[PDB]
Each structure stands twice: as C-alpha cells, then as structure tokens.
Symmetry: D3
C-alpha cells in the first residue's frame, strides 16, 4: 500500500513534470498529482491544468489528479499517505526546497523524495516555456502535444 | 570594548534568530539588535517586534533592541561600532548576503561575520512560520513561547 | 512489489544513515542496504559493517543487508529493482551525486531518489565521526549505541 | 567576422558591466551591447539615457556598438547575423537561472552563451544594489563609470 | 584574428568535450586544444589522446591539437592568444574553476570564457566513463565512436 | 575579555589570511592564530618557518599572537579559555565542509564559528594554488606578504 504525492501549480504541465510523474508511478503503488489552487491566477484555470495533466498521464493507471489548497502536508495526510515526490531541474531553488522538506517532516512526519528530471527536459519550466512561446519561440519539444496546442490557443487569443 | 549589530525584520523573531543573538552576546561586549522599519510594508508593528525580541532576550544583559531605517552601515557606525553578525539557515540566499557584505565593507568599512544557526532551528524562517501557522500547522517548537502566543492572536 | 537500494560504504553506519534507512523502509515494500566492497580498506571489515547495520535495523522487518562490488546499478537490477534511495547531509557533494544519478538512469534505467537526513544527524559523516573520536571527542549522540562501543573498541586497540 | 552580443537592462551600466564589455571587445571582432527593454515596466533611466551612459564609457572600444531591443534575446542576436552571447558573472548572480536560459536559448535558436567572471573589484556591484545604496546616501562612486554617477544622484534627488 | 585555447587531460575525450570544441571553433578564428602532460600520472598516452581528439574534430579546420606542460597561461600566451574556453558539466567544481580563472587573469591577463555542454552530454566525464566501462556499462552514446573502440581495447 | 582563534595550516600564510587576521584583531580583544600541524604529513614549510612568516606580517597587530597545535581545534580553543573560531571565506572555499565542521565543533565542545569573506583582491589566492602557480614560474608576489614571497621561491629552487 505505498504511495506518494507530486505537487505543483503545473501552469501548464511540462515534459519535465511528466517525466517525474512517470518515475513516481513506476516506484509507488499509488500516485496523486496535487494541483495548487492559489489566488496568483496563472494562464490556465485549475480545471484546465487538471485536464492537461489527465490527458498526458492516460498511460499511468495508478496515477490520479486532484486540486488542493492550504498546507501540502494536509493534502498528503488526508489521503492516508506521508510521502512527497518532487522533481529537480536546472533553476530549481533547491535550498528553499530543502527548507520546506525539513519543515514538512517536522510538522507532519511527511518525507520528501527528490528526483532529477531527464537531461532533455531539465531546462524547461512552466514560466520559461510561457515566456518563450509568447514571443514566438518553439517549445513544442518540451511540452505534451496536447498542452502545446492549448498554449498556442491561449496566446493566439490574447 | 567590542560590539556588533544583529539586523533583521524579525516579523516575528524565531528561535533561529534567538540562537544567533545568544552567540553574538556571548562573544561581543555589546550587541544591538536592529529592527528594520520598512515603510513599503508585515504582520507585527515595529513596537510589537521590539517587545517580542526583548521578552526573548531577557537573560542577555549586554544586548539591546532598537529600530532603524535606511542604510544598515549608518546604523552601525552611528553607534560607534563596525561589525555586523548575520545568521545562516537553510534557505538563506548566501550569495546575496556575500554581495551585501562586500558592499558594506566597501562603502563604510564595516565587517560582517556569519554564523550558522543550530540544526534544530535551521529550517524556520519568519515567513515560513507565519505561512504554516496560518493554515493551522504547529510551529510552537520553533518560536519563543511568547511569540507563538501572539501569533495565534493575530491569526484569530 | 516496490523496492529500493540504499548504498554506501558505512564505515561505520551513522544515525544519519539509519534515519534514511528508516524512511526508505517506511515508503517501499522492500529495502536492501548495499555495502560497498572497495579495496580503500577502511576501519571496519565488510562483515563488521554488515553486522553493525543489521544490529541497528532490527526493528525494520522489510530491510536486509548485503555486500556488493562493481556497478551499483548491477547490484540493484540483479535483485529485480530499479530504484536507489540516497541520503543528503551537510557536506554531501550533491553535484557529483546528480552526475552519478543521471549516468545510472542512462546506462540502466535506474531512478535515484534523494532524501535529506534529519537536522540532528545532518553534520555527522562516517569520516568526521572517526576523526573526532580518534582525538577523544564525544560522538555518542551521533551513532547507534552498538556502533559507538565497537568504534571505541577499534581505537583503544590501535 | 566573429561577434557577440552583451545583453542586459543596464539601468544603469556599472563598472562590472564595462569590464565584461572590454573583455568581449578584446576577444571578438565586433560586440553589440543589447539594452533590453520591458515595455511594461519603466526603470530608473529611459532607453536613450541608458544608451548614452554606455556610449560615453565605451568610447575607447572602436568595435563595440550599442542598440536597444525587446522580446527574445536570440532574435536580436540572429537578426544581426550572430549566434553568441557573452554574459558576465558577479557575486549574487543567479547562475542556475542563467544556465537554464542558456540551454533554452541554444535549444530554440542554436545560439551559444559564454560566461565570464567580472574582475574581483567590480564583483559585488549590481545595478539594483547600487541604486539601493545610493538611495540612502551610500558612496558608490568607485563602482560606476563617471558617465553614470552624478546622473544617478540627479534621478534620486 | 581571434583565438582561444580549450585545455584538459582528455583521457579520453568525450562528446561533452567535443560539443565545447565545436562551439569554440564556431566562434573564434583559431582554436587550440591543449592536451595536458602530467608526469605525476592516465589510461591513454599523450599521443593516443591527441590522435583521438584529431579523429573526433576532423570537420573543424580551424582547430588544432597540441600537448603542453606547466602553466596554462604560458601555453596560451606563447601562441599569441589570451583567451581560454572551458566547458561546464554536471559535477564541475565551478568554484574552483572561478578561482583559477581569476588567478589566470591576474597573473597573465588571460580571459576565461565558460560554456555549458549540451544536456545530453552533461553527465559524462572521462573518469566516470572509464569507471562505468571497466565494469561493462555501455557508454557508447557518450563518446565518439573511435574513442569507444579504443577504450574497449584498453580494458580487454 | 573577548577572543577568537584563527585556524589553518598557513603553508604559507597569504594576504587573504592576513586580511582575516586583521578583521578578527579589530573586533576581538585578543586573537590567536592557530597553526595546525599534521604530524604525519610534512608541508612545504616547517612549523617554525610558518610561525615566523605570520609574525613578520602581523607586527602591527598588538593583540594577536601565534601558536601551533595538533589534534582537535576545539581543544586548542577551550584550553586558552575561549570558545570562538573566526574562519575566512574565499573563492574555492568548500563552504559546505566548513559548515559541517562548524556544527560538529558546536556539538562536541560548544564552540562558535564566525565566517568572514576575505577582500575581493585576495579572494582567489590560496596557499595551495599560490604554491602551484609559483612552481611553474607564475607571479604571485601581489598575493603574499613580503615575509613569504622570496622564502617560497627559495623552497622551490
Ligand atoms: C495543497 C497543495 C497542493 C499543491 C501544492 O503544490 C505546490 O507546488 C506547493 C504547495 O504548497 C501545494 C499545496
Ligand atoms: C537600518 C537597518 C536596520 C535593520 C536592517 O535589517 C536588515 O535585515 C536589513 C537592513 O538593510 C537593515 C537596515
Ligand atoms: C555494488 C555497490 C554497492 C554499494 C555502493 O555504495 C556506494 O556508496 C557506491 C557504489 O558505487 C556502490 C556499489
Ligand atoms: C599547459 C597545460 C595544458 C593543458 C592543461 O589542461 C588543464 O585541464 C589544466 C592545465 O593547467 C593545463 C596546462
């Protein structure tokens, strides 16, 4: 009965995120992707972000996607789990991630496992992908095909 | 007669800060905790922050608490000192602290000494403590008792 | 059927290592502690290192201890697994750990999950503990009680 | 026909930036300083002021020119027939963010990024920290070119 | 006429090194790869290392390969240049590279430009490649073809 | 009666070390430079040579003295009735290892460690890199005190 939670805002989900989802799903019996509700409203609504993740994780039967707000550790514990799996990329503020991990262990006994994303997906972030795409750069190799079309949709209607 | 200034916003003071204050007070004849007034906007007023620090440092007779505005090195030099003691924790932007230390030495001849807080208090920050408490997380092991009491009152 | 391998030389095992073992054992169905055979001979023989780990992990029923040499990924794969759990402490060469993790994923498809050890055990390493103990410093709070007595035994016979 | 672009907001240019400009000009046939403007956020100096301050402090570098732009840096670079960026490193540089941007810029446009550490003397100055210190009266005159220092004090007063 | 030196032991040259050589050769009129002779002890001789690099850089007409001993900045200045191009990868000790760059500028006026290797080649190093291959791991995607062939021969 | 210990192997002392000594002496009533010796590995200079080179370059600091030792630094500190260490930071410092040692030293002996960044001008010198550069003829004379430079060249020849 093992399980982990993969948290983020995923605005939008990238192949970097998907890589981490896949590895978590391969090593734990159950995975929950936790989508942050946090009113800065990004580019996509929470429902849009959930849909894009669900579309991209259809081949992962033991993964589900749910939104949450408030403490991540509450999200995790209320589902009977006590592990978080967090991806590392180029540009990750790792010191802040370590601070949060130690706090989350202290207040709720939740462990955090870090995994580095694949080199190919190591320089994409949701923010940098949006920025580049806004100015006409090609990020199609860095996002799930579906996500990519939706992004083009939000820009070419702004 | 030696001396150092321990600067910060302390909104609120944490056990991480207190550990650093204690070590400064043990190693310098005089310590001044400098509480930043930033009119560009916290949870506690400057007077409340000063009072919380005084409560937590009651056993440190050579330490005093004062508010300050503007350039830290002016605050330091105006009190006849030229040393700053700054704590390090998990999540400290140390490269930025180093930049500021080298700047502060250049513009005023003020030295900065860094000390790592104890491992037990190394992941608390004023910001993260407030964030956790807001959502009902228990940070009472990470703050002085009087601070935790006031924090609950501000949220309730 | 989940599982992970916790690698190291463990010369000797510390409470930092034990903390990581406990977390791995709490989140995976099966854990193997892999003790490196690598002729620099340390302070303890491989058998001594294994014994000290077994003594300290008696309350972890799903953990076992085995020695290995050669590629870690071969050790992992030959046991039907493809995950490593590695602890982080103060003084960990994380950049080198990241390099090895990406190489190990490339050559064998093995994932590496990193977890930070508890703040209390974050400044102990096998090397620093031996060094301090050699010169008469008290490291009793940083090592399993058994390990501590064995260490005193190897120094007070040198 | 070698060449590189040295990008930044230069609000204002510092001696740390000039050090990097000088090194780039010594090592590439032509250097273009790219003054990158966010049309949605004003800084302290206007684009013409920024360019004037850079020109005045680079008059001894005959193979360097200064131009403004916005949008993608790699478009600015490729439109001038170049494909190299030279970026300085200082104390407080977010190097991981720079690396992320360098890898992204290579991926989307094939443009290379070369990093060079600025001289130790100029390694703790940044435009933002210089402005902050000067705002409260601190002496930053040794860290900025003459073309900048009193213009800065003028803005603040 | 611009130019730079790309230094290393290259024991053996990797695709990480080659990526950096290619970028240097694209941006400078002349590039010299400087192969370190260290009489304090590798797997390949200097002649073998030079030959492996030449095979891998056959398409780069403005790049040449030479061995060198002693101070890198002397090697650079003796060839009428004053720039070094050094690659960064995962596991690079960048603080030490920065120290050496500042030293090299101080003692000889030589600039050092750093470039990150491509993500695909970012975790290979000569040392880790040899270590993995010794135990039968497949690093053929990380080395030039001719290099991988020789490596197998040295181990067998 | 404040005081601190400044530890190192000082083989040889550099201007980066002297900068730190000077700052410690300006901020503590007494400073002891601790020349820590490994009885199992000789360096370039003998302990008496190391101490002589430090004394000659610190003659203007009346509240500083120099002593050698071995074993645990915290024992050296506590035997002099002190409980503070002042350690310099430079480019290339393994800061994580220093932090590990500082936390261990607090744990086992209650001794505090204060870190200070050395001046930018002296931030890239280390004893080992100075020796390596000088070995192959590079000019390190601006990075070492006069008490050191020609003694170093003497050892190498
Ligand atoms: C409840 C919840 C869900 C997702 C989250 O994702 C994050 O990246 C950070 C959070 O604090 C978080 C919290
Ligand atoms: C005048 C004053 C007082 C306290 C401070 O505290 C800080 O953390 C940063 C400052 O610049 C500062 C300045
Ligand atoms: C086969 C084996 C076992 C344990 C190990 O432990 C390590 O820390 C590093 C290794 O490469 C390793 C390899
Ligand atoms: C003369 C020479 C040639 C190649 C080198 O390569 C290096 O990686 C470091 C050196 O100091 C060096 C020196």
């Amino acid at each position: 009965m093992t399980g982990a939670v993969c948290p983020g805002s995923f605005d939008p989900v990238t192949l970097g995120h998907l890589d981490v989802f896949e590895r978590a799903a391969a090593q734990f019996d159950e995975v929950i992707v936790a989508v942050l509700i946090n009113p800065k409203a990004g580019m996509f609504t929470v429902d849009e972000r959930i849909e894009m993740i669900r579309e991209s994780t259809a081949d992962l039967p033991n993964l589900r996607v749910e939104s949450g707000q408030g403490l991540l550790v509450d999200f995790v514990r209320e589902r009977g789990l006590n592990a978080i799996v967090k991806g590392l990329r180029t540009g990750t503020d790792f010191e802040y991630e370590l601070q949060m991990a130690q706090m989350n262990k202290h207040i709720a006994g939740v462990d955090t496992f870090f995994v580095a994303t694949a080199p190919a997906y190591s320089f994409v972030s949701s923010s940098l992908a949006k920025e580049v795409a806004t100015y006409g750069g090609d990020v199609s190799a860095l996002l799930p095909a579906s996500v990519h079309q939706r992004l083009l949709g939000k820009l070419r209607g702004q």
